[PDB]
Amino acid sequence: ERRALKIGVNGIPVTLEPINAISNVGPRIVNQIFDTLVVRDFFSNGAPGNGINLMPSLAESWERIDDKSVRFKLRQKVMFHDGVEMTADDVAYTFSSERLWGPDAIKVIPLGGSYALDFDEPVVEDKYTVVIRTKTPTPLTESYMASWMGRIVPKAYYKTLGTAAFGNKPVGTGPYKFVEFVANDRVVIEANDAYWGLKPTASKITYQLVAEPATRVAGLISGEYDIVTTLTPDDMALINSYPDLETRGNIVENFHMFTFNMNQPVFQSKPLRRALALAVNRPLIVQSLWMNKATIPNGFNFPNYGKTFDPNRRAMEYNIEEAKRLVKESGYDGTPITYHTMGNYYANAVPALMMMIEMWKQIGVTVVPKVYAPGGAPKDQDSYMRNWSNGQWMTDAWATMICEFGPKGQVQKRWGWKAPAEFNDLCTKVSQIPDSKERFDAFNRLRDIFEEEAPAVILYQPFDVYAARKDVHWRPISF
Numbered sequence: 001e002r003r004a005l006k007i008g009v010n011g012i013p014v015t016l017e018p019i020n021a022i023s024n025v026g027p028r029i030v031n032q033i034f035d036t037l038v039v040r041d042f043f044s045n046g047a048p049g050n051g052i053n054l055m056p057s058l059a060e061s062w063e064r065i066d067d068k069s070v071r072f073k074l075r076q077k078v079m080f081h082d083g084v085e086m087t088a089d090d091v092a093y094t095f096s097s098e099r100l101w102g103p104d105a106i107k108v109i110p111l112g113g114s115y116a117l118d119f120d121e122p123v124v125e126d127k128y129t130v131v132i133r134t135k136t137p138t139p140l141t142e143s144y145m146a147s148w149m150g151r152i153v154p155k156a157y158y159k160t161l162g163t164a165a166f167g168n169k170p171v172g173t174g175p176y177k178f179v180e181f182v183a184n185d186r187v188v189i190e191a192n193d194a195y196w197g198l199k200p201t202a203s204k205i206t207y208q209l210v211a212e213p214a215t216r217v218a219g220l221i222s223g224e225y226d227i228v229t230t231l232t233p234d235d236m237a238l239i240n241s242y243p244d245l246e247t248r249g250n251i252v253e254n255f256h257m258f259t260f261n262m263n264q265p266v267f268q269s270k271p272l273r274r275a276l277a278l279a280v281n282r283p284l285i286v287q288s289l290w291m292n293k294a295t296i297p298n299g300f301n302f303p304n305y306g307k308t309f310d311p312n313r314r315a316m317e318y319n320i321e322e323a324k325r326l327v328k329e330s331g332y333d334g335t336p337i338t339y340h341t342m343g344n345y346y347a348n349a350v351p352a353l354m355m356m357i358e359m360w361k362q363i364g365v366t367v368v369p370k371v372y373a374p375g376g377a378p379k380d381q382d383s384y385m386r387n388w389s390n391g392q393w394m395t396d397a398w399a400t401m402i403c404e405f406g407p408k409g410q411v412q413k414r415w416g417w418k419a420p421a422e423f424n425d426l427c428t429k430v431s432q433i434p435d436s437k438e439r440f441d442a443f444n445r446l447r448d449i450f451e452e453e454a455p456a457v458i459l460y461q462p463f464d465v466y467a468a469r470k471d472v473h474w475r476p477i478s479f
Helices: 027-033 088-094 097-101 155-161 213-222 233-240 270-278 282-289 303-308 320-330 349-361 398-405 421-430 437-453
Strands: 004-009 038-041 053-056 059-066 069-074 123-126 129-133 176-182 186-191 204-209 227-231 245-251 254-260 337-341 367-371 385-391 456-460 463-469
Touching: 004 213, 027 176, 027 186, 027 204, 053 059, 069 088, 088 097, 088 123, 088 129, 088 155, 097 155, 176 204, 213 227, 213 233, 213 463, 227 233, 233 245, 233 463, 254 349, 270 320, 270 437, 270 456, 282 349, 282 456, 303 437, 337 349, 349 367, 385 398, 398 421, 398 437, 421 437
Parallel strands: 004 204, 004 227, 337 367, 337 385
Antiparallel strands: 038 053, 059 069, 069 129, 123 129, 176 186, 186 204, 227 463, 245 463, 254 385, 254 456
């Protein structure tokens, strides 16, 4: 009745601490180990997979008290995997200054600051009642608690171990409990039959890194894997020709990109960054490698932003006449520039890069691929161009333009983008005003600045494909 699942994955996260595991490969594991206060009903209001009504989870109920404060009434007798009962203390600690958004917390959850709402210290009213507060008004508290920032950690155990060591031996309240983590290789979790919710339906889950997609497809065909991730539309015909197997594909609320180390002199200024951006022929890449199933957004602008999505925004520019003119202006000597990619951690990363190398050769720039295996990431000083993705994890344009690219983010702080002052002032402004024409127009100005500055270059939203045995009716890979 309960089988051990073997999942062939594109990558293994560097840690299982839930915030530091935020990546394309960590949530699928940490979402089984941990729970959130509330969850999104992805099928609410007729939504075919990405709906937004919030439903109870670790919180049985919740009440917004005012524009800064939300009271959560917690489920009782919820046990962490080590037998310690979850209480309001744990929830308060999860969103505390000490763990998440204060100055010392920034050092160990480097991105806790940039991804935190403007929290004030939570208040514990009683064993099962906590109030989550913000120093300034924000309507996002409740939906943030359903996000990948909201996974609840055990205060005593986490504080004792510290963020790094906790990430190697995580304890949560989720339906599966930690067994093993071998860096760059596998994670094993096992059924938690003390789970407060529905009993787990698998006895154990092993996430095994299988770097090459063709090896993952061959492993599903041979029965070595029950489920495999991060395939492309091109793999679908072969898999679906096996009656026992099937594929599932969808546009995901994530965009692939390439970006730059702007601490490097070659990328400290926008001309050469923008030149590389304007030479990307996105429709050709989508037609060649994605069977025309990947979507090209009209800027840093996605429908899940709701009131801050602009359906009439212009397309991102393709102008090799201007790209050639900007290469000449930059004084680009012709020196080869590396583009680092961890194989096909991102689906079609290497074939899209090879097509972009040809496009960049056509505008006078020489880009050379530097393909590395998991754990072989270069030091920041050795990184120039690289690929990345951003998951659009809020129903508001604050994520990821402000999270990642704003003044508190890693693109400016770690990777050296010296953003125009109007950009950082607009980031500050949008975060202190409600949904309105002012806020909507402000995000459009930020999008315009993003395209002019090219701290990153959006490629497309991938058509993510996974595959599985038809007789495997539950798949913990987080669509």
